[PDB]
Each structure stands twice: as structure tokens, then as C-alpha cells.
Amino acid sequence: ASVKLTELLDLYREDRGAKWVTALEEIPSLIIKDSLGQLVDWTMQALNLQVALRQPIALNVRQLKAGTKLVSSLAECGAQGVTGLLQAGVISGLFELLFADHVSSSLKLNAFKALDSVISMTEGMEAFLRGREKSGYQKLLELILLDQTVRVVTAGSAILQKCHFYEVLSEIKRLGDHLAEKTSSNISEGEIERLINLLEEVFHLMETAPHTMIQQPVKSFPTMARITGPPERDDPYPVLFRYLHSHHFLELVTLLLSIPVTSAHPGVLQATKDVLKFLAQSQKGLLFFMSEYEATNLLIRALCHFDAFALWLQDSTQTLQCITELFSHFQRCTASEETDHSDLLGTLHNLYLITFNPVGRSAVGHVFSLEKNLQSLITLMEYYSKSVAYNYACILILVVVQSSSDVQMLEQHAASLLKLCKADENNAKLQELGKWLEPLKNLRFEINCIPNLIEYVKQNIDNLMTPEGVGLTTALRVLCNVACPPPPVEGQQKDLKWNLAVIQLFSAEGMDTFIRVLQKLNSILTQPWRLHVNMGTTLHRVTTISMARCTLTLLKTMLTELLRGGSFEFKDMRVPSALVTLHMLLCSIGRLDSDEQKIQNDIIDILLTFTQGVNEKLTISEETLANNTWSLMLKEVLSSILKVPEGFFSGLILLSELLPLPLISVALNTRKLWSMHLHVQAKLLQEIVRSFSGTTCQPIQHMLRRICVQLCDLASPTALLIMRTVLDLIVEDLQSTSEDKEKQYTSQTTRLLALLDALASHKACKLAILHLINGTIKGDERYAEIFQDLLALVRSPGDSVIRQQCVEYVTSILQSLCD
Amino acid sequence: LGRQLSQGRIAQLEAELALQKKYSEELKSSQDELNDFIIQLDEEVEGMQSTILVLQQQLKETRQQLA
Amino acid sequence: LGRQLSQGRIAQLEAELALQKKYSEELKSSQDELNDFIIQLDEEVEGMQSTILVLQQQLKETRQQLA
């Protein structure tokens, strides 16, 4: 290609016309695989309108369109190209076309793409922002004001959003250098708050980068649903990592974690660990850490001397290094004459040693799930198919397949693994690996394969968490990324494949299958728990957690889109009746663990979709309120809480998580809607308070008090009803003792008075207490009588200890009442 | 009573939904065809835009030549 | 219980219908917006033809001037 490029360049040294335009159009293919000066001189003449005007028909707009493709090709070659382009004046030369008159919107839209490839390197954005004379930033700002079409105001916004990210990293560096070097007074909460605020912008401008910082194809329109465009896109992350490297991001996070003032701050440790967590979830991000390998170790030490993020990062970096070594071994040494070569035995031994602790198997199975890193082990077996290298590879592949949950490597490698497992029928480590990839028999991962996976699960549902039924962990992992989109990001375009996926799920009987999966998983951990297999190995725990998470994600994806805006009703009372028991079994211990907590969040999210789908007009009729999607879910949850003596403390956590936080337009809309539905289940809510009042347990009592406070803070009628219930409990407790004899005070009475004292501290409960004791309601004289009894008890104390607690509680109640 | 109402709901609803699902599919296909038509309309539009820009540029060239 | 099976089957079919109708709505909205963008492109085309006409007319005047 180089020889061809030399011939073309020398032939048209001074030739202009159709031949020159043909050469310009042909060059970009050649450059893929001092001519740079001549190429730069050619590029600046193809962008000149004074040369385009002097050419015949159809040859004048093909010279300008072909001059914006030499920019996108010369800049990507390296810094030596961008430096020459900037020295020639590409920034100013690309703005004489956008500002020019009568230019079509498809040639202006191409000049933006040439500029996006110039400011994509740190040498470029320095010249774009700081003028060389007006800068390019000011020119683009003026260009936005001018009236443009829909696709030109969208292309110019991507350049602006990319410039913002470069200017949030520049202020972080200055702020940190001034914070640490100078002061360490000036280290106040009005200055640290900027650091946490700036570090939440870096995490925000990289999560939304693929959507608001890329240049869309010329034939794509900014619609909220993606239609009429090429399917491919561009990856912005290499540029972002190029900016982070130039600003020395890692050499500064270590500075914030190694300074007397802000290292101890819990809000800065958490803020900087969310950028690092996101950055290490990709192959490009993990390779970013190993580029400056010296600065990564110091960061690990700084994060470590202060929960297992440092250990996980160390394991991931070691795993990636070993994988790179494995790939490099089969390149320099194409043929392995010595099967047991010492270098590869050492590499395999280190990889095997990493996989002992549970935090090591979650990092070995994570790096191997990115790109095509699983090919090294398959190649190592195929070369040798015993050798010791074979055994280690078999063990490592079993580990990766068992542990990893993002099964995208299986869409291409499942063909090799199955035939390799068929080849060796006597190895006990391959007869098990072939059982995991059982559903993946002649399967192509699109929507058309969803019914096959659902059919396989439906058939082999009887064997869950058994040696034979280990293919259900993979048949549910595969089905959970084909049809379940990742969480939405602001600025996205709603792809229409995800609606068809959910339609296919509903057509292939996904609902019943997933309900059966959840029910079967529930009735193993509780009734068949008599075997007391309480996660004896790391397999029984990880497998169960993965199945639970996958089923929950599928259920949430189906129910969110189905019950989106209350268009359609839902009455199947099986989903909000097995999520409670799953919460009791799994989320029983905060939960933490980064996996037990997410299950609770998903359970709450699935339960909450029954409230959003509500009718705001049919809020008066008794039939329309007692048979709503809200009321049925609430009845099922409340009944489920009061069905198992063991399931009380966990149920109160669920009830607390459902209800809104204790005490503008949307705040009152939901709070009063909650009280309207809660009023129907009066007998169910009253049963919670009375049943859990007669027990002795500090966590249970504290949860009960918190729930009472929340329900009182909801709205007024519910608070009054709860106060009626509790004071009626007081009335019956004091009426249980015969008035003929001396009044009997028990520990239950002391607990009840403590409950009244705890409730009375809140103004919302205060108003209800005052309204009830005022006696305005007809038939409200009993509460006045019981208050008079309390006053008489105050006037007539005693010497008993229980009498002492009663007197102190009643005095505290009266003190709160006087306020 | 309730059982007869449920059975009638079952029968008539399943029948008429099965009948009108096909017309819903026809509507989807018609919208897909309309989107295709819009695609070629767009393509023709930018073709005319480029050709017209060529015409203006050669007109301006003749202008600079004559003056 | 007949109610359980009735609600299950009706829920399956009506969920299919509701998801289909949604798909139609956010296809139609996008088509309408794309038609609006096409209208913008046509406005550009007409204005650009207008400047063609103006420049060609002035071409005729300078041609008659040259004689």
C-alpha cells in the first residue's frame, strides 16, 4: 500500500481536476495499511471553497467532501499527524465551511466529524479551547446561535459536551493541588464540598458519554426512538482514557487519599471509589490501570491502609497480566515442543493459586468474560489434545464458567468447548464442564432463540441446584441479557428491539415459567432446609444467588414495561406473594455484600410497580378502590407478613422499605394516595400493631415504632386510626385488672406506655393525640376516662418498681402533651 | 352468575383478540413500509441538495469569470 | 378456580396487545417527527431553488448588458 501511495502522491504534485479528486477519494483506503507534509498540503487545498468553485459539475462538492475524510484519517495515525494538521490551520479551515453561505446540511455535517477527530487528542483540545485570534470554542458558540437544521444543532452539541469533560478534569487538578500542597483554615466544608461535587461530574460525564459525546451517522435523526439509520456507532472511551492519562488522574486520587484532612472524610472516599469501580468494568479500563503499572500499586496501598475493592483490583490486574502472558506464549513459540514448559506452568500455577478465596474467583471469572480472553485456555487445551498444563486449563475454565454471570463469551466459544468436552469422555473435569453448556446446543443468541431457552427451562425445571440440573444457571443467565436492557441513561434513544423482546417473552409463556422458577427456588431453602446445607461450598451459594438475581431481573423487566403507565391492569397474585418469602430466606440478616442488597432493591422495585399503575380518577367508588392493583398488592403483602412466626422482623423491614420516608406537588400526591388505599386494609394494619405489641424483642420493638411513626407521618386519618388502636390497647390493658382490687401493673403496660411516649414526641402524632383526648368525637368519652385514670395514678403513686416505671412513663407522656 | 360471566369473557375476548391481532400486525407492516418510503424520500432529498449546491457553485464561478 | 385460568389467559393475550399497541405509538411518534424534519429539508430546498432563480435572473440581466 505504501508503494501505491508514493506513486499517487508524486503523480498529482500539481494536478488539479477530476484525476486529483479521484486520488483524494482513493487515498484514505491506502493510509490504513516526507509524505506527511504533502498529504497535509493536499488536505488544506481540498477544504478551500476558492478551489472548489473553479471545478466543473459534480466535481466541486466531491472535492470538499473528500477533504474532510483526509482529516479523519491523518489525525488517527498519531500525534505526528494531529500536530501537522493543527499547524496548518485545520481548526480555522473547517469553520470557513460551516460559516459559508449556501452550504448543504450534509457537507456541514461532515465538517463536524472531521473536527471531532481533531479535538479527540490532547494536542487538539488545547488548541480548540485556548486560541492560537478567536478560538474554536467561541466560533462554535456563535455558530449555535445561528439557525441550523435538526442534525447540525445536535452535532455541534456533541463537541460542546466533550469540551465540558476536559474542563471538569482541569479544575479538579487545580483544586487538588491547591488543597494538598498549599494548605496542608482553607480546609473547610465550603471547599471540600466542591471536590465531592466535581468528582460526581466525572462519574456523570462518563456514564452518559456514549450518547451525548459521539458523532452520529450523517443519515441519523435525533428522535427518541432509533429509526432510519445505520446500526453501528462509535466508542468514546478510548478518548476519555486519553484525557484521564494526560491529566494524571491516578496520581491525584492517591493525593486525596493520602492527606491528613480529606482522607478521613467518608464522602471523598466514597466519591472517588465510584469512578474507580466504573473504570475497571471494561477491558479498555483494566488495560488503563496496567499502562502506568507503577501508579496503580501506590493507589492500591493508599486505598488499603485505611471494603475488598483493593484486593479485587489486585486480583483483576494479576489475572489480566497472566492472560496477556498466555496469549504471548502461543505467539513467539508457535509450536510447543515441550508441553510442560516451565513458564506456562508457572503462569497456570499463579492463576490457580488466585482462585482459592472467593474474592479471587470473582476476579478470575470477570477478566475472562471480557472480549476473547477465554480463547487462550481453549487454545492451550487444543494444542495438547495427560500434560499438567491440560489439567490446570480444565480447572480454570470450570472456574470461569461456574462463577461468571455475564455470559457473552458463550455466544462464540460454546462451539469449541462442546466438541472439546465430547473429545475427552474420561476426564471428570470436562464431563462437568459439558453439563454446564447443555442448553447451548446449536443456539444463535437473538430474539428467535428465546422460546427454545424457555422451553428448555420448562422441561428441566425439576432439577434445581443438583449436579444434573446445573444447566438452568446458564439457561437463565443467557436469557437475562438477550431480553433485559441495562439500566437507562439520561439522553438515550429508545431502541425498539427491547419491546419486541418483551413481546416474545410474553408469547413464549415467560410469566408462568419464571413464577414456577421462583416458587421452586423458595421451596428448597425453607422446607427442604432440614438437610441443613447452609452454603457448604461456594458453588451452592453463588448458584442460588445468580438464579435469584436472574429471575428477579427478568420479572422486573417484564412487569415494568407491561405496567408502564396504568394502561393495562394486572391481577395475578403470585408475584407479590413469593417475593416476601424470598426476602425472608435470603435477605434475613446491613445486608451489604453487594449481592444480597440488590435482591432487596429488586424486590421493592417489583412490588412498587403495582402502585404506579393506578387510576387517579376512579378514586371514590368502593369497587374501584377495593379491587385496584394497589389494594391487591397491599393485601397480599400484609397477609404474607402475618403468616409465619419466624417471618416478622424481616417482614417489618419490607413494610418499612415500601412506605415513603417519614415527614412538593408530587410529595403530597403520593402521600395522600397512600393513605387512601391504606384505609381499605384497616383490619390488616390494625392486626400488625396488636400482634407485635405482645412480644419482647428490641429490634422488633424498634421496627414497630418506626413503622408506626411512618404510617402516622403519611396522612391524618391513618394516624388517628393507629392512635385509636394503641389507646384501645391501653384501655383493654388497664381494664384487664379488676377495679375492685389494687391496680396491677405489668411489663406489657410499661412497654405500651413507652410506645405512647415514643409516638408522642412527633408533631404528627401530637395532633392526633390532642384530637383524641379532646373528646370532640361522639363516643370518645372512654379515652377521657382512661386519661383520668392515668392522672389519678399520677396523684396516687406507690413504692413498687413497676409502679416507678409506670409513673415515669406517664410523667413523660404528660410533659410531651403539655408542649 | 360470576362463573358464566367469566366463561363469556374468556370465550368472546379470546376470539376477538385473536381476530384483531392480525389487523394489528398489518398495521405494524404498513408502518414499516411507510418508514421505508421515508428512507428513500430522505435519500432523494440530500441528492437534490448536493446537485443544487453544485449548480450554485458553478453559477458563482461563472460570475467571478464574467466580472 | 376458573378465575385464575381466565385472568391468566386474558393477561397473556392482552399483554401481547398492549405491548403491540405501545410499539405502534412510539413508532408513529418517531415517524411524525421524521416527517417534520423532512418538511425542514423541503423548506431548505425551496429557499435554495429561490436563490438559484435570483442568480439566474441576474445572469440574464448581465448577459443582456454584455451584448
Numbering used by the authors:
A (entry chain A): 381 to 413, 426 to 524, 527 to 578, 617 to 738, 755 to 833, 844 to 1047, 1051 to 1124, 1137 to 1292
B (entry chain B), C (entry chain E): 171 to 237
What does the paper say about this structure?
N6-methyladenosine (m6A) is the most abundant and prevalent internal modification in mRNA. In mammals, m6A exerts pivotal roles in posttranscriptional regulation and its dysregulation is implicated in various diseases including cancer. m6A is installed by a multicomponent methyltransferase complex (MTC, also known as the m6A writer complex). The mammalian MTC is composed of the core m6A methyltransferase METTL3–METTL14 complex (MTC core) and several regulatory proteins including WTAP, the adaptor responsible for METTL3–METTL14 localization and proper substrate recruitment, and VIRMA (KIAA1429), the specificity mediator that mediates preferential m6A modification at the 3′ untranslated regions (UTRs). WTAP and VIRMA are important subunits of the m6A writer complex.
